[PDB]
Design a protein around this ligand. Structure first.
Ligand code: BN5
Ligand code: BN5
Ligand code: PLP
Ligand code: PLP
Lengths: 816, 816
């Protein structure tokens, strides 16, 4: 078997008795009534047993050495399953595979029983998860802090072609990886009012909610380091949530506890979109307030807070945890009694902010009346921060009255709002973009004024993905043939993949690379019929676009091409065309009407295309249901063509693009986000780039975008629009897609028509290359061998050195 | 050390490593950061490990032998702590005590950390718990079925003398004894409507709630038998509780799941009182519906249901689970398609009902409109059952038109109601009272008409208590000296206690019995200052009345005596009186105004009495806060005088009275409930009986009860009433107790004044006996030696033989 570790004689034996120990004592089951679910749990408990020894010493180690601690605050942690990942980082995979084999069980069958920890929406949440893995592997004293939602991202079901949402009760059967720590429970306050006394302000008459932490281990890759991800759960106090007497009902008071506990009930399913609901604000303060208390308590142990920034670094994943800034000030000034200026100095020095997008509708602008009611003291502090900051601007740009209102944290208008992004820039010593182009756009556009004020704050840290889950875990076959030639060191040193460049002409390697891709496609084609049922051809080109559904991601542009391919086949049926299976998957936010309309369009196209006899097996349109982390681990290794076609300047970075590049897929995309650095790394000749560049989009906006022009000059495009309009794809409901056509023609913010011509032309070129297996594979090798820059180990090493002030280390911790 | 088992060399060693295994692997803690709570859990997991082996074989055994199964349905199971009880029934106590000692820990300190499983209100819930223990010890294939409330009986706090209720979050830190079984999850229906088709009625368009079972082991006493207590939890389905589309909000739909799950959220805190709230009805159907499905599934394994009653027996603990009757019919007729008559025959033969009280306000009378809306089909079935039953009556008593309306299950009037008690009698083959006198009152009064119709149905089964928790566990010192003389066999054969009768004149035994009582009092006096703080004299007579607060229990009568004692001391200060520490404890239902007023009266008396310098240490009035099972295990072994003074004919049986008798307390009480059989067993000369007999109460009711008469002829009583009226006990609020005085004088349903004179006179006699230590102790020995009849092992053996048709067995199951 592969390099999933050694199957030692002693350890396979030990593993088996421990599996049986847990099956008996833990699951209280006996082999005659044990269900596959029981088997999965016995295995999970057995594997978890192997890292507790290390978990304890790692934490005890940090207490003894007392290094600078890194706190990664995020309202999202898209973790996925954790059994296999743990086996991989502990080098237990083969041993476990062997032991379960002898016990007569299929480890892979058991792995499929674990529920995904879908505590994230998409890119932002998955980045946090990849980062945690990298920080452990690089031996950093890092803690992931978030909310323990009992309901993560909804499960997507397709009914009559429409998306149906259903509760993700991932904790239903229990979570063997987490452990409640009811000793560090903390109180969080809400509402109340502010009393200004003789020696300071006081936040009074507040409603209290308790925060209970749950620890989940985050093991580094084979270095015996296990860090901690601490997730907070909301709990109602038993007193006032019953003790505020004088009629109401005792039963009711108890039932009403599910009001304070609703705070950690569900994750908001919005990807790159802001909804100013009070429940959202409560979750944001809740995670911030509890986390900070825990951070300061740890520090008080390790009162001159002058050294605080030397021992603490808190990274803000977007503006979601932005209240950490005014909350840190509140504690320092109100409770610790530090002078404003000393407090501010400390705050700015420990906080750093990461921007994830430039679309306005994703920007957090919280109405003042909301902050006024829920967090009165924080509003006062934000006003004071704004006051002193604007004074700084005025001093720097005397008389520039418009710049003052442009930079204010407070926005005037219909209703006053607080620009959380401006808050973060002012109270952070570092602000970074997630890709070189996005980082430049921030300085030239969105945060230009801030950049002019303090240029030193703005940096870039191109995103990355973990090669452990995204290669070794999901594509062992590819990881193995690579290791056969260059060794195993690249798993924690992805740059070494370049060494594969010297095998680009190796006949055996070319054959191998092509073989694992073919095995991956056969396995996925099988899984498709197994769990979803309705056949696909594994010899065709696997064209896949998987990511959340968004107008800016342009799944619609993908559809136009699919319809074009179909129309061409119907025009010349007996002409040869490279067979394709185009797969589009992704979830739409429940309130995003357009995004839900696009899913129906995709399934509607498949209904026509998939049953046309003249088309045969040359073209299949499949919608990948419930796209999530665990599903990504299956499709990506099986893809040939990765679609990254967002309008230039809208996708901050993207990460799925990197996952595809590492797994042997070629990329067709625009010069957007990280696509630019990937093409730059692999060489543009090895990439399928097309469409407008940022500049072209801007030129078009100056003169004005008119979709009619494109409709008028392109007969193929016109034909498609008239097919949608006449009900060709919706016979029973001829006007079903009027909203889509209307939008494309009159309010297309992402100019889908503008990139149509260059897109289908470019798609022609990928089909030409696919016809030449040998050359396709050689280009694949150029992409894989050149993907090393996109490992989150590189990203983290840069954050560590350029933002946190800590030195990464690949030193093995002193055994378990 | 005592007979808490052997401290074997191998087992103490084994215990210690397992304690450390769990502390490390399970609690992921290390000795340097382990909290006492961690230590308690490591011990609990280690002890639980010892019974899983037996739990599995016991259950597998019942599958193989396939005996008749006993199902005990109750909405209450007052369990208390379970660590010590498990150690006792497994004979692990000494080994565990030794092992933790060597590990440098105090086992008793760790035991106090466990949370009480307060899933009961009082007597009814505790009986179910004692019964489960007896059924295991007698080797019966029995299952306890109930609801897993996340909030049990509220925790009682006394503020300014008033009771304050606060949520009992007993699961906060987890429950090491339970185990979720998500494989046997079942659906329960609500609402909907009934469609009458060609081949039967159909219950349609219902709302579904899922029932998830949690198993808790119930170990027999040293016989290697471990039965199961299965508790249901309400869970919302992820579909319709989200899938019923067409606007509303996705977030809201998820938050609204806490609406179907509220069913198992909290226990109704009513003791002997009926509240017709919909939530209560839902809990009742919920436990019934899920339990029955589980019972039939088990049977289908073991379709002629003719044999059903031969393999199944379901005991109804009060009318709370009465819907089991129409629900069993529904399943048999609607789903299994059995003819009505065959179905009814089966139902009556498998169901038995236990009545617990005769007070009207405790009777369950559910409004028809409620059953009509929530359970439409059941209402139809109840009407049909009533129809056929009344036809039986008419045939038996031709022309007796008044008897017909008296016996109907349907009550006419303001609003129509369903008499659940009448339902139970009609569909059960056996109806029993809980004490000989209560059982006779049922036949002569309340259910006279039913008794005349089917005399064979009515039986008696005097309640009992388990000698394991109620003697060996809470009073090891007494259990030991008893064992020193007559051996250990009496623990599971209480009748052998009679053998102690021959030591009634033994000088050494008399001294010993008196010594353990004195040690028990010193320990309790200590615990009082430790956890509640404010001293008491351990040399005084410990006069205690602990039970729920009720007008019928007459804590008020107890107060009158206390005030009388105080008034006499103030009249003749330098006269000698036997010192007393009277302790009154118990919880009042939150909506029971009078009961809450009585608690304030008790604390108000203590405020005056406890600070009067002339009184000195001769009289202390203490209110025992948060009386519960774990607290009972502490006070009872320390009591000298047990107060069981309910008005004759109101306390069906009582069980606390038995606990006191087994632990060396003398009883002062009325000829009520089981008090009659206890005095009968011990000899009236060894009991302090007083007041009216049932007959006297009836005579008084014929002529009419006038409290003024007693107030007029008794100067001491008058003086007390004038003290309450003038604010002597409430200076700042002189009219604070007007409600109590008003009630006593004009609407005393329990004639407190009528028993006043005989009560204080009798109290004089107990003080006279206490002055003679030797004789007091000899009378104590007569009570203890004669308590054997009150073991729940005797009760269960009678249920088994006279109702269930099964033979108890004290055979050890084939090792673990
Ligand atoms: C019931 C039982 C077992 N049972 C066990 O280990 N465990 C449990 O039952 C069990 C499971 C969970 C919890 Cl919390 C408590 C228990 Cl006691 C093992 C072997 C045989 C057995 O009887 C035969 C069942 C039917 C088998 C068949 O149909 O093939
Ligand atoms: C932190 C730690 C340990 N810690 C451990 O076992 N366990 C944990 O920390 C722990 C506990 C629960 C969970 Cl889910 C996960 C972990 Cl990793 C043991 C020995 C030393 C140690 O450092 C010193 C702490 C301070 C001691 C003092 O002040 O006396
Ligand atoms: C990697 C990943 C994403 C982010 O994908 P992009 O194409 O960058 O938007 C979203 N969802 C899941 C399940 C992922 O694994
Ligand atoms: C035994 C017991 C009861 C029942 O007591 P009675 O005096 O029969 O009403 C109530 N509560 C607890 C805690 C008990 O242990």
């Amino acid at each position: 078997i592969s390099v999933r570790g050694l199957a030692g004689v002693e350890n396979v034996t030990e593993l088996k008795k421990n599996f049986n120990r847990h099956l008996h004592f833990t699951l209280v089951k006996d082999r005659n009534v044990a269900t596959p679910r029981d088997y999965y749990f016995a295995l999970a408990h057995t594997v978890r047993d192997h890292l507790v020894g290390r978990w304890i010493r790692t934490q005890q180690h940090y207490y003894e050495k007392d290094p600078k601690r890194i706190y990664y605050l995020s309202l999202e942690f898209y973790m996925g399953r954790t059994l296999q990942n743990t086996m991989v980082n502990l080098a237990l995979e083969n041993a476990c595979d062997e032991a379960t084999y002898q016990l007569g069980l299929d480890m892979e069958e058991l792995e499929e029983i674990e529920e995904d920890a879908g505590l994230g929406n998409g890119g932002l949440g998955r980045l946090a998860a990849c980062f945690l893995d990298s920080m452990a592997t690089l031996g950093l004293a890092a803690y992931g802090y978030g909310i323990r939602y009992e309901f993560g991202i909804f499960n997507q079901k397709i009914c009559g072609g429409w998306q149906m949402e259903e509760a993700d009760d991932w904790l239903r059967y229990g979570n063997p990886w987490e452990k409640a720590r009811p000793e560090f429970t903390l109180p969080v306050h809400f509402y109340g009012r502010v009393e200004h006394t003789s020696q300071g302000a006081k936040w009074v008459d507040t409603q209290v909610v308790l925060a209970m932490p749950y620890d989940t281990p985050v093991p580094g890759y084979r270095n015996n380091v296990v860090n901690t991800m601490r997730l907070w759960s909301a709990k109602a106090p038993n007193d006032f949530n019953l003790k505020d007497f004088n009629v109401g009902g005792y039963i009711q008071a108890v039932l009403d506890r599910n009001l304070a506990e609703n705070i950690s009930r569900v994750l908001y399913p919005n990807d790159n979109f802001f909804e100013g609901k009070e429940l959202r604000l409560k979750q944001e303060y809740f995670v911030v307030a509890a986390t900070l208390q825990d951070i300061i308590r740890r520090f008080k142990s390790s009162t001159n807070f002058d050294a605080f920034p030397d021992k603490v670094a808190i990274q803000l994943n977007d503006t979601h945890p932005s209240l950490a800034i005014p909350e840190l000030m509140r504690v320092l000034v109100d409770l610790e009694r530090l002078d404003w200026d000393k407090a501010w100095e400390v705050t700015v020095k420990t906080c750093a902010y990461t921007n994830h997008t430039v679309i306005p509708e994703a920007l957090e602008r919280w109405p003042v009346h909301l902050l006024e009611t829920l967090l009165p003291r924080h509003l006062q502090i934000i006003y004071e921060i704004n006051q002193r900051f604007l004074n700084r601007v005025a001093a720097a740009f005397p008389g520039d009255v418009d710049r003052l209102r442009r930079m204010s944290l407070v926005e005037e208008g219909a209703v006053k709002r607080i620009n959380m992004a401006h808050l973060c820039i002012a109270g952070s010593h570092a602000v970074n973009g997630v890709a070189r182009i996005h980082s430049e756009i921030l300085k030239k556009t969105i945060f230009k004024d801030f950049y002019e004020l303090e240029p030193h704050k703005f940096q870039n840290k191109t995103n990355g993905i973990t090669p452990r889950r995204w290669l070794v875990l999901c594509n062992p076959g590819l990881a193995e043939i690579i290791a056969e030639r260059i060794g195993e060191e690249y798993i924690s040193d992805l740059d070494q993949l370049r060494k594969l460049l010297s095998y680009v002409d190796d006949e055996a390697f070319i054959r191998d690379v092509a073989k694992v891709k073919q095995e991956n496609k056969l396995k996925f084609a099988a899984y498709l019929e197994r769990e979803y049922k309705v056949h696909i051809n594994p010899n065709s080109l696997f064209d896949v676009q998987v990511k959340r559904i968004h107008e800016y991601k342009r799944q619609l542009l993908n559809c136009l091409h699919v319809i074009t391919l179909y129309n061409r086949i119907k025009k010349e049926p007996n002409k040869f065309v490279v067979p394709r299976t185009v797969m589009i998957g992704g979830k739409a936010a429940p309130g995003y009407h357009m995004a839900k309309m696009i899913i129906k369009l995709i399934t509607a196209i498949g209904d026509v295309v998939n049953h046309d006899p003249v088309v045969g097996d040359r073209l299949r349109v499949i919608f990948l249901e419930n796209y999530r982390v665990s599903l990504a681990e299956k499709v990506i290794p099986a893809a040939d063509l990765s679609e990254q076609i967002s309008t230039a300047g809208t996708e901050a970075s993207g990460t799925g693009n990197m996952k595809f590049m590492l797994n042997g897929a070629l990329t067709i995309g625009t010069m957007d986000g990280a696509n630019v650095e990937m093409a730059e790394e692999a060489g543009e000749e090895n990439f399928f780039i097309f469409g407008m560049r940022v500049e072209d989009v801007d030129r078009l906006d100056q003169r004005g975008y008119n979709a009619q022009e494109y409709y008028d000059r392109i007969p193929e495009l016109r034909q498609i629009i008239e097919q949608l309009s006449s009900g060709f794809f919706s016979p029973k409901q001829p006007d079903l897609f009027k909203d889509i056509v209307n939008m494309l023609m009159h309010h297309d913010r992402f100019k889908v028509f503008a990139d149509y011509e260059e897109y289908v032309k470019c798609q022609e070129r990928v089909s030409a290359l696919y016809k030449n297996p040998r050359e396709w594979t050689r280009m694949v090798i150029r992409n894989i061998a050149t993907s090393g820059k996109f490992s989150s180990d590189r990203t983290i090493a840069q954050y560590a050195r350029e933002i946190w002030g800590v030195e990464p280390s690949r030193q093995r911790l002193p055994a378990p």
